[PDB]
Structure formats: structure tokens, C-alpha cells
């Protein structure tokens, strides 16, 4: 369904009796603005509206028993909400007041956003696999999808930029409300009578989406203390999402934690096909001691290739299960998993940690 | 929906057409609580061996819980029946599978997991808390055993464990997702063949207020956990204990909502940033439980202040909790229960846990009705009964030099 | 996590309320005896 | 101490009504001129009692330029009191420069505190 | 000259009547051991000998007025000393007891070495240009000459490793004593009767020099706060050292700080030909504001190429001056500056700072 | 307080002479046995007066394993003195384990301090 703004509304019954509402800003993610703006915007979403402040909306939401978060993804900026079915008219209205008329007060920028954003960036980058994945996106998709997912002080952002990003995005065409456990008619009525009805149909002065421009054969190395990690990244067209989900599930995927898979026989190894609107990245990562990772990444590379077509076909059902597990309300997924062969020769490589030990790309 | 097959095994399924993915799992009770020090971790090792078998396109995983163990075969909806047969086979050939198995790799993996829970500070803290609280009984043993005992396990011990615990009276087939229950029951009936036997007696356990301090000054924070004898799955105060815990709820200092969270403890602890994070929990076993909080303090000079303020807020439970806090806690507990039961894997695990440990599973609507009935006076009665002036169990890992001795924290439990 | 030392012998034979009630009675008796002595002095 | 919320409440209670406005406002300017703080370079908001958590938050949330200007004005006032001398009329703070720069931040602080108090007693 | 250990001695008169004695451990630099060992070794050099402790040798040296330092270079580990002509018999002896029987006590490794090495690394890397140069060496000479020049916690080193790297190095064939303003015969006598006479001719179980293996066409990006910097690196054979010294001086070189040169016309730009035993790296760097550097690096690239052969020939004398300036006692330089044209098309590129602003290699 | 360097000087002055050695050393072992510190788990070097810059530096420069062993022995001694009990003879520190582990570091600290003092008065 849609309203005059062209705000898509989708609703479907849920299992657990929670109306897990969610708003997906199509291209307000880390790919659109300058590096890290989407993270700060996400940190501003639920603080201070024109209707209810942070200390009021949070207190009421907790009283109403719901949970709310704003997570940044390279494609879209997601505002997730979860509440009991009777509580829809409240949260939806609040969500409207979040997309429109968010205050962006400098005191919230310097007290609750920059501190929180920096803390989350430091916490996430402490995991060598996550920082390796960020570098792999950086070197595979030079711009857009490769922009760092989190704010970094290396690219200073001022509150004016964050506010201008909230505007110039969040337009009617640019947002999609998706709910699980809410009647589509009732949700459409609430959205029509909420603040969503006031957003502009399209952003006048921004949202000029750039081409993906996938780049292959590159490599990078990011020295780190503690645990090391070696990653291999295959860029994939959207139409190939099926071939690699089968490959990943064939060798072992983060979505499906299970021994007995070829990639699980080596410590700390995993694989995962990050899926985006216009491109994807199949990442095979190994983590742990630098000495272990050195041979683990080479073994994982040799496992990804030389995977029997019979086992690859047998893994189709595991891939279907993995896709169904990933298809959360926040990130709808429609990938047809075919057993087709998936090449690996076009890999980018990233090393993190004890660079004196980790292998180079020419060593695979 | 329940059906007692031949052999007396019960298939319990919670089917819902909206489920994204289906799951089915055989759980045979007798977790670590059924083990003893010499053979600790054998249940987890056996379940890992069983779940390491060929998956035939499904997703086999082990459970390895404190009081029950099982193998769960997650799979897309249409494939569920196949997964059914799979697990049935995996359990009809359990002794054969264990006999033909070279445990070296599986024991290495289990010891790796045991070290993992010995390195993740929260896992270490709660494992030590449970061990000290129920010290002297099998319930004190780790779910995954210790890195010393695992290497001492052999195939024969696993076979003995299976023969004792993998019996019809002590097993349940849980399932969830979108499928016809009758089809799954029929598919399992033709394939499930497990030995007869009486349900093993569940070993006793009694809470003993104690304190354990693994002080490691090299860590960056102080990971402490303080609890009291809680409510097991049996107790009618189960949901009441959850509400009492939720009254104080969670907290993370760097979370955006940190300055706005309802709980009074949260507002108290930003004034000097006493604590980095904490979370109140009501862990519930078959007949006993642990109700308390876990906390990570960054500033090593404020452990005492945090413990003081948290135990004062606990004192507030039996006296001055207002209707607003009780209403918030009820709503948050209802939402948390609904969240825990969204994933079909989680629903399968919960079905197995309840059917094995309490015999009957209260539907989510019944749980909501039972939580809604709670009044503030009920919560205060529970606080007087189980919290006010009651023994506490303490655990700490690093930089806990500031964590004062047992008497100070214990006496904080009864001052006004 | 690890084996605790056996406190079996160290344990009291009183119930949860009994031991706490007796401890509080003794402490209160000490407090009020001190109050009586201080009042006399 | 009286909250800026209550002070502004009373001030807007007076300013809205033309009779009280006409009677008081000339007296308000006369009182503020006779106060003598402007002769020491201080704006009114510099005089506010800083030693309160609300006010401390208000200063802690000032912009950079206003914060530095406030620091310099306070230092100049301290020096003038120290040397027992006043700014000449041309250098004193004019009535139009006494712009009530810090009031909005204090009002925001009090709004936050009042909402927190109200919700704690929901 | 030489002694039975094959320790080369070079001595020549000096202008300023200071005996700027220096010892050059040929291949104990940052290229030889695992990343960062040479830095820690250089920090251990002058602390505790088998003859005089740190607090005694330093006090005596300061009484004597001399200065001493240990600097790590990718080729060699240099122990420089500088003292009045009367003071040779002391310092030379000390230097012997530095190469032989240096104590390497753990309390120095934890109190004076690791803290000092970490402080020096942090101070050096705070400069975006130096971080960029280290990354450029890493990506141009993947091993050996590309090893980080300073100790980094990402590659932990234990005292035993530094001690075993002092041994198995420092051998007679591996050290070259160079002095300025000391009679070669007197210096030969002092060295012969010093501890240098007891060093083994060659290391029995180490010092297996690896080939250079220059790599080109690579790039890297190192996010950093504060000042940004974009660098371009041409690997060059030793026989080409003449061509690029003329090129650098033609456009502007760090050794010759002067306006009026084409590269000095743009803010923050500079060039320099790092010269090593078996390879060299010609680096054109720009530093400062990210927006300024973005255009500055492209301007510098366009300047380095398209340099008139007539102006290149005119720059021959300036290049000879620069070579003469660089040829200090520690770093003897023998490069014949010819005006032959020097290509740039084979450049590596590294960016540091605001990676959202700095261009990619594809933009030159 | 007697500098450990002087204590070792005296000890080697006695030990070098066979008559004084044969006389004292039996009395030395007997005195260290009667001292009673070994029954509480303490090695000799645990008793040393920690509150001195030289001693504090020596402790600061101990290896990790020795440092943790010393910490546990001191904690055990405190607990034993607290509970008024002694270790059984089989658990007490045997004469062979009283190994003078800390003396080398103390002597190094003393050497550094004495060199600094000597050079400061050069």
C-alpha cells in the first residue's frame, strides 16, 4: 500500500504476538551521505522530536513495554520497533515524529550522539573480523557501499550536516514502513493520519544515487593488537545472490552455526554473503591467533573452491533455511538459491593483526 | 499440541502458519545437573557427537543446557518432516554413533567451548556464580564441563550416560514452525527407536549464600554479579520473579537511552558514572533459580558504590516500588517473553525445556494473563519473601579489589 | 567453572529465617544493653 | 532559589498585560541600570548563580564563542573589582548588548529536569 | 681497512674537529628481523654493557661532552657518537661493549625500552606524512624493506627475540665502523684492541638476506585524525638513483627546502628519494587539509611528469648538492646524478586522513 | 635499615671462611627453622620490608609467575595469622624451597642506587 507521499506500507501477521514495526529509509544508510553521517543520524532518530522529548518518549515507550532501536545499514537506515499489538497507534505516530521534525539539538549532538557513536565504533572495531569486513567493503566498493558503516573522527561531521542529511532524505519515495503482526488497513490508517503524511514525495536537492562500481583484485592490511583476522571478498551481482548463498551454506555460514561443515573444521573460520540493493559481497573470514589464521585462511580459500557440485546442490536446502533466517522484518530478502557454480578467482583480500605473520594476497 | 507416541515418548509442537522457518528437536533431559565431577561435561560431549552427524540438508545443533540436552534440526518448513526422520535416526542410532566416534576432535571442540566460557567475562562470572551458589551439588557443574574433566572422558562414559538418560520416559520431541503436526508425528513414529527406562531422578540442589572472587588485575573492568535464591520454573512466582527483575531492568552506559531509561538505579548511576553496564535477570532451573544482576564497572574505584546503590534499590523492592514501576516491569516482561518465543528454534527449545522440567508449558496468552494479574502488593510480598534480608551469592573477575567483603554487601540487603 | 571446597561441616543447621532472626536478636540485644549502660553512665 | 522557569513565568505574566508592562518595564530598565553590573562589563546572565547542577549543565552546553566571551567578561569583572575601578561609559555594556544569551539553555535544562521529575512521579 | 673479524673501518678528516664516530650494522635494520625487532634492539644498544651500566656510561659520556644515539634504518642499525677529538679511546671501547655483551635485562625491556619504543612510534605516526611513508614502503616492498620501521604492538616481541637478534647479527662481516675526524690508524688500533675483535666473522644461524621483490601498481588508505596526507611512490633500482635525485631536485626535495620550485608552489608538497642498498623509493607527498591535499597530490603528480628535460638538466647541480647534503657519516651515499629522464607511470599511492575527501589512485 | 648489599657482604664474609661457616651455618639453618615463618607458607624474601623505594622497585621488577606466587604466599600467611593456625609440616615451606628468589633483584636495585649516589658525588 501507499499514501500520496508514495510511502510504501507492508504488513503481515506475526508469530509471537508482537507488532514488530519497522521503518526502512531506503537510501539514508552509510552509502548515501559522507562517511559516517548515517550513523550519527541513526543516533539522533529517537532522541528529540517536535512532539515528545527523549526523556518523555523513552519513558512512555518503556511503560508501554516496547523496545526501539535505530540501526544503520549500507543500503538503508532502519528504525526498528517492537511492541504488543495494542500499542500500534502510539509507536507509529512516534515514528512519524522521528522522520519529521527531529530536533537535532547541539547538546544532544555533543552529549548523546558523538560519545555514543564513538563508543560503538570503538567497540565494533575491537573485533578484528568486523574491521576486516569494513576494510573489505572499503576496497571492494571504493565509494557508496564502501563507506565506513560507523562514524570515525577521521571524517569530521558537524551537526548542520547531520540535520541536512535528515532533510534531503527521509522523503516519501525514500522510506518504506514494514510491519510484522499488524493489520495493513489499520497501519495504513495510522500512517495516513500520522506525520508521515507531511513528508515530501522526493528529496529536491539530494539522493542522487551513484553506481556501485565494484572493484576486484585489490588488497589491504590493517595492523591490530590482539586477535588477528584474514578475509576474502568476492563482489557479486544481485542476480548471483543465489549462487553464493548456496556456496556459503555449502561450506559454512554465520547464519547457520553448525559443525560438520567444511569451513567449520578449521578454527575461527566462517563465511557470509552480505546482500545489498545493487551489489553483494561474499566474505570468507578467519580469526584468532595470527599463526592459526595464516593457515586457516589458505585452507578456507582452498575449501571455497573445489567444492563438489553434488555437495553444492545438497546445500541448496541449507541455503534456503539460511535465507529464511536472514529475512527479518528489517531486511526483507528475496533470493532464489540455485545450485549453480560460484567462482572465487576475483577475490579481494584483507589482513588484520600481526601483519608480519598473516599471508599476502599472492599467497591466497 | 501433544501426542504420546508408542514407546511413551511425547511429541509437543507449537505450529503457527506465520513462522519463517521450522524446527524439530529431541531433548532427553539430564544436562550437567545429572553429572558428577569426574564425568562432568559428558552430556555436552554426547550431544555434540550426535549433532555432528550428517545433516542431510538440515541444520543440526546441540543444546547443552544445565538440566537438559538435545539435538535440534532447524530447516525450512516444507523439509520439516525430513528433519524429523533425521533426528529420529540420530537418536535411534545414538549408541552406534558414539561407539564409532573418535572423540579426540569433539573433546578438543568441547574444551575450546569450555575455555570460551572461561574467557568471556560475563560467561565466567555467571558460571562461577552458579557454581558457588549451588556448591556441593551437581547443579554447580558447568553446562559444558571444565577443560580438565573433558580430556578425561571416553566413549564408554558417553554410552553409559546415553543408556541412563536417553530413554523414552526421559525424552521429548519438540517442534515448531508451519507444518501439519500429524505428519511429523507419523514420520517420527516409524523412525524413533530408543531404549525403555524410568525417568532418572533429578539430583537435589540447595542455594548456599557464598562469594567467589577470581580477581585478575590485568582485565580492563570489574565484572561482578550478585544474586539471591530465585524462582525455579515450578514456582508460581516465576513470572513474578521476572517482573521483580524487570523493575530494575537493563542498562548500558553508552547506549543512547542511557540518560532516559526508567529504572531508578539507571538515573542513580550516571551521576558519577558508577557502572558501565548491568542487567537484572531471573535464571530459573527446574526447581530452583538465581535472581539478581550482572554488572561491568569500568571505573575500578566505584565497585563499592555500585553494589551499595544496587542493593539499596533492591531494598526499595519490598517497600517503595510504585505502580508505575510495576506496570513498566509487567509490560517489559511480557514483551521479553514474546521476543524469546519468536524464533522457531527458541520456541522449540522452550517447549522442550518446559515439557521436560515442569511437564506442562503455559501458552503465551496464559503467561500474559498471569503477568497482568500481578499487583504492586504481590511484587512487594515477593520482595519481602525472597529478597529482603536474604543471603546473596557474589562473583567477581577483575579489578574487584574495590568489591568489599561479603558482610558489607549482605548487610546492605536489610538497611531500610 | 571449577570445584568449590566442601563447606558441608561449616554449614549451619538453622533455617533461613531462624539464623537471621537469632543474629538480629543478638545484635539488637547488644545495642540495647549498650543503650542501658550508656543511659546509666 | 527561584527557577528560571518560574522567573520567566512571572515575567511573561507581567509583560502580557499592558498596564503592568508600562508601569514595570521602565522601572525594570531603571533598576538594571542602577544595578551597576553593566559598568563592570558583565551581562545579566553572567551574574546568575552558577553553583547548581541545572546551571552547570546550562554553561556546559553553551557554544564555543559564547563560552569564551563569558569567560572574558567574568575575568574582566574580577579584575575591575580587584582594582576598584569601573569601565568608562563608552566601554560599559550597553542595554542592547545585555541580550539574555544564557536564558534559553537554562530553560532547556529546567525543562529536562521538570520532565524527569514529572515522569518519576507518573 | 679491516681486522680479522672483517670489520670494515673508514676514517676521514672532519671540518668541525668533532670525531663523529658511527657504527653501521649492515643488515640489522628494520628489514632483517621480524617487524620491529630492530627498533627495540636500537633502544637496547647503549643501556647495559658487560663493562659499564647505563647510569655509569651515560654519566661518563656527558662528563666527556659526547653525544650518542641509536637510530634504526631499513638497511642498517646505526649507532652514532659525537665527541671531541681527545675522546676517541673511550667511546670506541664503549661501542665495542655495546655490540658485544649488551645485557638485555628484562627490567630494561619493560621500563626503558617498550615504553620508549611505544612513545617514539606514537610520536612518529602522529605525523600523517610518516605514517603514509611507512604504508608506502609496506605496499611497495611487501617484506624486508617494507617492514614497519618502528615497534608496533600488533607484532608482539619478547626479550628473548631481541637478545637472539643481537646475537646471530652484529657479526664482523655485518658491521662497518665509520668515523669523521679521527686518524684511521689510531681508530684501527683502538678497534682491534676493543671488544670488536671478539665478534664472530659471520652469523651462524641468521642473516639470510631475502630478495627485494619490488611491487608496483598497488595502493592503500590509512584513516587518521587531524592532518591528512597523500603520497605517491615509485620503486627504483639502485642504478636509477641518479635519475630520480635529479628529478626530485628538479621539482623540489625535502633536503633542499626552498621556494620557487614547482612542487614548492603548492602547499605542503615535497619529494624525496629514499635510498637503500638494493632498492629505493621516490616519494612525492602532500600534507595538510584534506581538501587542499586532494588537489595538491594531483598537481604534484602532474608536475613530476611533464618536467622539461632542459629544466631537468638544470636541476643536475641542485641534485648533486642534495646528495652531498644527505651523505652524512652514518648514511654514506654514492649516486651519480645524471639528467636521464625518469618515468612515473608505475606509481603506488597511499592516502591518510579524511578518506572521504582524498582521491583514489584511479584519479592519480 | 640495613641495605641488602651489606647483608650479602657480611654473609659472604662469613661463608668464605671455613671455621665461621661451619659454626654459623648450622645455627643459621636452626634459626630459620625456629623463626616460624616457614610454617605459615612464607619464604624468607616474603618477610622483607616492602615499604622502601629500592624494595618497591625490586618487587615491581619481578617476573609474572614469581609475582603471583609471592602474592598467594602472602595471602596465605595473612589468612593463617587471621585464623590462628599453622600449615601442617607436609604443607609448610621446606628448607629447599626457601630459595632466595627476590635477592637478585634487590641487589640489582641496590647496585643502581649506589652507582647513582657515587656518580652524583663524583
UniProtKB/Swiss-Prot annotation, chains A, E:
Cite the Pfam families for this sequence.
Peptidase_M16, Peptidase_M16_C
Q: What else is known?
A: Has antigenic properties. Elicits a specific immune response in systemic candidiasis human patients undergoing malignant hematological disorders.
Transmembrane regions: none
User: Which of UniProt's keywords are assigned here?
Assistant: Electron transport, Membrane, Mitochondrion, Mitochondrion inner membrane, Respiratory chain, Transit peptide, Transport
What's the protein here called?
A: Cytochrome b-c1 complex subunit 2, mitochondrial
- What function does this protein fulfil? Component of the ubiquinol-cytochrome c oxidoreductase, a multisubunit transmembrane complex that is part of the mitochondrial electron transport chain which drives oxidative phosphorylation. The complex plays an important role in the uptake of multiple carbon sources present in different host niches.
Stated induction or repression of this protein's expression: Expression is induced by interaction with host macrophages. Expression is repressed by nitric oxide. Expression is also decreased in stationary phase. Expression is repressed by HAP43.
Q: What happens when the gene is disrupted?
A: Leads to decreased vegetative growth on several carbon sources including maltose, citrate and acetate.
One biological process term in Gene Ontology = mitochondrial electron transport, ubiquinol to cytochrome c
Q: Name one GO molecular function term.
A: ubiquinol-cytochrome-c reductase activity
Q: Does the keyword Nuclease apply?
A: no
Instruction: State the family it belongs to.
Output: Belongs to the peptidase M16 family. UQCRC2/QCR2 subfamily.
GO CC terms in record: membrane; mitochondrial crista; mitochondrion; plasma membrane; respiratory chain complex III
The record's subcellular location field reads: Mitochondrion inner membrane
Cystine bridges: none
Q: Membrane topology type, per the record?
A: Peripheral membrane protein
From Swiss-Prot, chain B:
Q: Which domain of life is it from?
A: Eukaryota
| Gene inactivation effect | Leads to decreased vegetative growth on several carbon sources including maltose, citrate and acetate.
Where does the UniProt annotation place the signal sequence? none
Tell me, in one coarse class, where this protein mainly resides.
mitochondrion
According to the UniProt entry, its GO molecular function terms are: metal ion binding; metalloendopeptidase activity; ubiquinol-cytochrome-c reductase activity
Q: Name one Pfam family in it.
A: Peptidase_M16_C
What's any one GO cellular component for it?
Answer: respiratory chain complex III
Q: How does it sit in the membrane?
A: Peripheral membrane protein
Q: Where in the cell is it found?
A: Mitochondrion inner membrane
| GO terms for biological process, alphabetical | aerobic respiration; mitochondrial electron transport, ubiquinol to cytochrome c; protein processing involved in protein targeting to mitochondrion
Give the record's keywords alphabetically: Electron transport, Membrane, Mitochondrion, Mitochondrion inner membrane, Respiratory chain, Transit peptide, Transport
Induction, per UniProt: Expression is induced in the presence of amphotericin B. Expression is repressed by niric oxide and during spider biofilm formation. Expression is also repressed by HAP43.
Fetch the InterPro entries from UniProt: Metalloenz_LuxS/M16, MPP/UQCRC_Complex, Pept_M16_N, Peptidase_M16_C
Q: What does this protein do?
A: Component of the ubiquinol-cytochrome c oxidoreductase, a multisubunit transmembrane complex that is part of the mitochondrial electron transport chain which drives oxidative phosphorylation. The complex plays an important role in the uptake of multiple carbon sources present in different host niches.
Which family does the entry's similarity section mention? Belongs to the peptidase M16 family. UQCRC1/QCR1 subfamily.
The molecule here is called: Cytochrome b-c1 complex reductase subunit, mitochondrial
As recorded in Swiss-Prot or TrEMBL, the protein's gene is named COR1
Curated annotation (Swiss-Prot), chain C:
TM segment ranges = 18-41
| Induction remarks | Expression is induced in high iron conditions. Expression is repressed in alkaline conditions, by niric oxide and during spider biofilm formation. Expression is also repressed by HAP43.
State the superkingdom. Answer: Eukaryota
Instruction: State where the protein is found.
Output: Mitochondrion inner membrane
Q: What does the record note as the disruption phenotype of the gene behind this chain? A: Leads to hypersensitivity to azole treatment and sharply curtails fungal growth in the presence of macrophages. Leads to decreased vegetative growth on several carbon sources including maltose, citrate and acetate.
List residues in topological domain: Mitochondrial matrix: 1-17
Which family, according to UniProt? Belongs to the Rieske iron-sulfur protein family.
Please give the subunit comment from the record: Component of the ubiquinol-cytochrome c oxidoreductase (cytochrome b-c1 complex, complex III, CIII), a multisubunit enzyme composed of 10 subunits. The complex is composed of 3 respiratory subunits cytochrome b (COB), cytochrome c1 (CYT1) and Rieske protein (RIP1), 2 core protein subunits COR1 and QCR2, and 5 low-molecular weight protein subunits QCR6, QCR7, QCR8, QCR9 and QCR10.
Role description: Component of the ubiquinol-cytochrome c oxidoreductase, a multisubunit transmembrane complex that is part of the mitochondrial electron transport chain which drives oxidative phosphorylation. The complex plays an important role in the uptake of multiple carbon sources present in different host niches.
Q: What is this protein called?
A: Cytochrome b-c1 complex subunit Rieske, mitochondrial
Full-sequence range covered? 31 to 71 of 213
From Swiss-Prot, chains D, F:
Instruction: Describe the task this protein carries out.
Output: Component of the ubiquinol-cytochrome c oxidoreductase, a multisubunit transmembrane complex that is part of the mitochondrial electron transport chain which drives oxidative phosphorylation. Plays an important role in the uptake of multiple carbon sources such acetate, lactate, amino acids or GlcNAc present in different host niches.
Q: Which family does it belong to?
A: Belongs to the UQCRB/QCR7 family.
Where is this protein localized, as stated in its record? Mitochondrion inner membrane
Triggers of expression = Expression is repressed by HAP43.
Descriptive protein name: Cytochrome b-c1 complex subunit 7, mitochondrial
Task: Give the knockout phenotype.
Answer: Reduces recruitment of inflammatory cells and attenuates the virulence of C.albicans infection in vivo. Leads to mitochondrial dysfunction and shows defects in biofilm formation or the maintenance of filamentous growth. Leads to decreased vegetative growth on several carbon sources including maltose, citrate and acetate.
How does the entry describe its membrane topology? Peripheral membrane protein
The reply to whether Electron transport figures as a keyword in the UniProt entry is yes
- Where is the major localization of this protein? mitochondrion
Quaternary assembly: Component of the ubiquinol-cytochrome c oxidoreductase (cytochrome b-c1 complex, complex III, CIII), a multisubunit enzyme composed of 10 subunits. The complex is composed of 3 respiratory subunits cytochrome b (COB), cytochrome c1 (CYT1) and Rieske protein (RIP1), 2 core protein subunits COR1 and QCR2, and 5 low-molecular weight protein subunits QCR6, QCR7, QCR8, QCR9 and QCR10.
User: What InterPro entries does the record point to?
Assistant: QCR7, QCR7_sf
Amino acid at each position: 500500500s501507499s499514501i500520496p507521499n508514495s510511502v510504501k506500507i507492508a504488513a503481515k501477521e506475526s508469530a509471537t504476538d508482537l507488532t514488530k514495526l519497522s521503518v526502512i529509509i531506503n537510501n539514508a544508510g552509510s552509502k548515501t551521505g559522507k562517511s559516517g553521517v548515517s550513523h550519527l543520524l541513526s543516533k539522533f532518530t529517537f532522541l528529540n522530536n517536535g512532539a515528545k522529548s527523549a526523556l518523555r518518549f523513552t519513558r512512555e515507550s518503556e511503560l508501554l513495554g516496547g523496545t526501539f532501536e535505530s540501526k544503520v545499514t549500507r543500503d538503508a537506515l532502519i528504525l526498528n520497533t517492537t511492541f504488543l499489538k495494542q500499542d500500534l497507534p502510539y509507536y507509529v505516530e512516534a515514528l512519524g515524529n522521528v522522520v519529521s521534525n527531529t530536533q537535532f539539538a547541539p547538546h544532544e549532538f555533543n552529549e548523546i550522539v558523538l560519545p555514543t557513536a564513538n563508543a560503538e565504533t570503538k567497540l565494533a572495531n575491537a573485533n578484528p573480523a568486523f574491521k576486516g569486513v569494513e576494510k573489505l567493503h572499503e576496497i571492494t566498493f571504493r565509494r557508496g557501499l564502501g563507506n565506513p558503516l560507523f562514524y570515525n573522527e577521521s571524517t569530521p561531521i558537524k551537526l548542520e550536516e547531520v540535520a541536512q542529511f535528515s532533510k534531503e532524505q527521509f522523503s516519501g519515495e525514500n522510506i518504506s514502513i514494514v510491519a510484522e503482526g499488524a493489520n495493513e488497513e489499520d497501519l495504513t490508517k495510522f500512517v495516513s493520519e500520522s506525520a508521515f503524511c507531511y513528508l515530501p514525495s522526493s528529496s529536491s536537492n539530494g539522493a542522487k544515487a551513484l553506481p556501485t562500481n565494484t572493484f576486484t583484485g585489490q588488497e589491504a592490511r590493517v595492523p591490530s593488537s590482539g586477535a588477528s583476522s584474514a578475509l576474502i571478498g568476492i563482489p557479486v551481482k544481485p542476480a548471483d545472490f543465489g549462487k553464493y548463498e548456496v556456496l556459503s551454506a555449502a561450506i559454512g555460514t554465520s547464519t547457520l552455526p553448525s559443525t560438520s561443515t567444511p569451513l567449520a573444521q578449521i578454527p575461527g573460520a566462517t563465511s557470509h554473503l552480505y546482500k545489498y540493493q545493487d551489489a553483494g559481497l561474499f566474505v570468507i573470514s578467519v580469526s584468532g591467533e595470527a599463526s592459526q589464521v595464516a593457515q586457516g585462511i589458505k585452507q578456507a580459500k582452498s575449501v571455497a573452491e573445489s567444492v563438489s557440485s553434488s555437495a553444492l546442490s545438497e546445500a541448496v536446502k541449507a541455503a534456503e533455511l539460511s535465507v529464511a533466517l536472514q529475512s527479518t522484518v528489517d531486511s526483507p530478502l528475496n533470493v532464489k538459491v540455485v545450485a549453480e557454480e560460484a567462482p572465487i578467482s576475483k577475490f579481494n583480500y584483507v589482513a588484520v593483526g600481526d601483519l608480519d605473520v598473516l599471508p599476502y594476497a599472492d599467497e591466497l | 499440541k501433544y501426542t504420546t507416541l508408542s514407546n511413551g515418548v511425547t511429541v509437543a509442537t507449537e505450529t503457527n502458519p506465520a513462522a519463517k522457518t521450522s524446527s524439530v528437536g529431541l531433548f532427553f533431559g539430564a544436562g550437567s545437573r545429572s553429572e558428577h565431577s569426574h564425568s562432568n561435561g559428558i552430556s555436552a560431549l554426547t550431544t555434540n557427537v550426535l549433532a555432528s552427524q550428517s545433516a542431510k540438508g538440515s541444520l543440526l545443533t546441540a543444546k547443552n543446557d544445565r538440566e537438559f540436552n538435545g539435538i535440534i534440526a532447524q530447516t525450512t518448513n516444507d523439509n520439516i518432516t525430513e528433519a524429523g526422520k533425521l533426528i529420529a535416526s540420530i537418536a535411534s542410532n545414538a549408541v552406534d554413533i558414539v561407539e564409532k566416534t573418535d572423540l579426540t576432535k569433539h573433546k578438543q571442540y568441547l574444551s575450546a567451548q569450555a575455555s570460551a566460557v572461561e574467557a568471556d567475562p560475563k560467561s565466567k562470572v555467571l558460571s562461577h556464580l552458579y557454581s558457588s551458589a549451588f556448591q556441593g551439588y551437581s547443579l554447580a557443574l558447568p553446562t559444558l564441563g571444565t577443560t580438565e574433566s573433558v580430556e578425561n572422558l571416553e566413549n564408554q562414559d558417553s554410552l553409559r550416560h546415553l543408556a541412563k538418560h536417553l530413554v523414552n520416559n526421559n525424552t521429548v520431541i519438540a517442534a515448531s514452525g508451519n507444518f501439519d503436526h500429524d505428519k511429523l508425528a507419523d514420520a517420527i513414529e516409524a523412525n524413533l527407536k530408543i531404549a525403555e527406562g524410568v525417568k532418572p531422578e533429578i539430583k537435589p540442589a540447595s542455594f548456599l549464600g557464598s562469594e567467589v572472587r577470581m580477581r585478575d588485575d590485568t582485565l580492563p573492568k570489574a565484572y561482578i554479579s550478585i544474586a539471591v535464591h530465585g524462582e525455579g520454573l515450578n514456582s508460581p512466582n516465576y513470572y513474578l520473579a521476572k517482573v521483580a527483575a524487570a523493575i530494575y531492568g537493563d542498562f548500558y552506559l553508552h547506549s543512547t537511552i542511557a540518560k532516559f531509561t526508567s529504572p531508578k538505579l539507571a538515573s542513580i548511576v550516571q551521576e558519577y558514572n558508577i557502572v558501565e553496564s548491568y542487567n537484572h535477570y531471573s535464571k530459573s532451573f527446574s526447581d530452583t533459580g538465581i535472581w539478581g544482576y550482572y554488572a561491568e564497572i569500568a571505573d575500578k574505584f566505584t565497585v563499592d558504590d555500585f553494589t551499595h546503590f544496587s542493593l539499596k534499590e533492591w531494598n526499595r523492592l519490598s517497600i517503595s516500588i510504585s505502580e508505575a514501576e510495576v506496570a513498566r516491569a509487567k509490560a517489559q516482561v511480557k514483551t521479553a517473553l514474546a521476543k524469546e518465543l519468536a524464533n522457531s528454534f527458541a520456541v522449540t527449545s522452550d517447549i522442550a525445556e518446559k515439557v521436560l522440567l515442569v511437564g506442562h508449558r503455559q501458552s503465551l496468552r496464559e503467561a500474559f494473563e498471569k503477568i497482568d494479574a500481578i499487583k504492586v502488593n504481590d511484587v512487594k510480598e515477593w520482595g519481602k519473601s525472597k529478597v529482603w534480608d536474604r543471603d546473596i551469592v557474589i562473583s567477581g573477575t577483575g579489578l574487584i579489589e574495590d568489591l568489599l567483603d561479603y558482610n558489607r554487601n549482605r548487610n546492605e540487603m536489610a538497611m531500610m | 567453572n571449577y570445584q568449590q571446597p566442601d563447606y558441608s561441616s561449616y554449614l549451619n543447621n538453622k533455617s533461613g529465617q531462624g539464623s537471621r532472626n537469632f543474629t538480629y536478636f543478638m545484635v539488637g540485644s547488644m545495642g540495647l544493653l549498650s543503650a542501658a549502660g550508656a543511659k546509666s553512665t | 532559589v527561584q527557577s528560571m522557569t518560574s522567573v520567566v513565568k512571572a515575567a511573561n505574566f507581567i509583560l502580557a498585560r499592558p498596564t503592568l508592562s508600562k508601569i514595570i518595564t521602565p522601572l525594570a530598565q531603571k533598576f538594571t541600570a542602577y544595578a551597576g553590573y553593566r559598568e563592570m562589563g558583565l551581562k545579566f546572565n553572567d551574574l546568575l548563580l552558577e553553583e547548581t547542577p541545572i546551571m552547570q549543565t546550562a554553561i556546559k552546553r553553551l557554544p564555543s564563542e559564547l563560552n569564551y566571551s563569558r569567560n572574558f567578561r567574568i575575568l574582566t569583572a574580577h579584575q575591575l573589582a580587584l582594582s576598584h575601578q569601573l569601565l568608562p561609559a563608552e566601554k560599559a555594556v550597553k542595554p542592547e548588548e545585555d541580550d539574555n544569551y544564557l536564558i534559553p539553555y537554562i530553560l532547556e535544562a529546567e525543562k529536562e529536569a521538570f520532565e524527569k521529575a514529572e515522569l518519576d512521579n507518573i
